[PDB]
Ligand binder design. Structure first.
Ligand SMILES: Cc1ccc2c(c1)NC(=O)[C@@]2(c1cn[nH]c1)c1cc(-c2ccc(C(=O)O)cc2C(=O)O)ccc1O
Length: 152
């Protein structure tokens, strides 16, 4: 089955934009209007024909597909990383499981659950300029829902 890609930006439910913070990390903060160009453009890839399903596996690439968001164990704990890939072979028709998230649309917002680590989600802190991380709790102070804005 063929793969479809969309370019987009992500904002958490409290309107914090996502930006790079060096080569290995994303941070979330409320950006000023003139700094809006700092927000990361993602290439969200998924399999064509699943638009009506409740859970849609997605891969999130960035840097013109040079990096992908990846879920790996670090110190025996699910961790979000930015993994380097050869952009020529991406996105794959069969993406490696560590790059896959179930995109679930709840109350008009988006939630990204790790396919490799169930009940672990892409998360942000309430505080400004803190790293984007994989979190195991929902409903607490950590934010697990986002809105998406299409670039192309
Ligand atoms: C671009 C793109 C994204 C995502 C995928 C592809 C390409 N190609 C795929 O095959 C892909 C897919 C299958 N259906 N739709 C897309 C896929 C799905 C899973 C997956 C997701 C959720 C769960 C769960 O437990 O909820 C289990 C698994 C698993 O299969 O272990 C793992 C690897 C994988 O690559």
């Amino acid at each position: 089955a063929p793969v479809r890609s969309l370019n987009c930006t992500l904002r958490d439910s409290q309107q914090k934009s996502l930006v790079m913070s060096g080569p290995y990390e994303l941070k979330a903060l409320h950006l000023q209007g003139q700094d809006m160009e700092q927000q990361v453009v993602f290439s969200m890839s998924f399999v064509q024909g699943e638009e009506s399903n409740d859970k849609i596996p997605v891969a999130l690439g960035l840097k013109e597909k040079n990096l992908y968001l990846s879920c790996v164990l670090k110190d025996d704990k699910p961790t979000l990383q930015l993994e380097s890939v050869d952009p020529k072979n991406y996105p794959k028709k069969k993406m490696e499981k560590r790059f896959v998230f179930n995109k679930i649309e709840i109350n008009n917002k988006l939630e990204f659950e790790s396919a490799q680590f169930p009940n672990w989600y892409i998360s942000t802190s309430q505080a400004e300029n803190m790293p984007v991380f994989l979190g195991g709790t929902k409903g607490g102070q950590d934010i697990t829902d986002f809105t998406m804005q299409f670039v192309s």
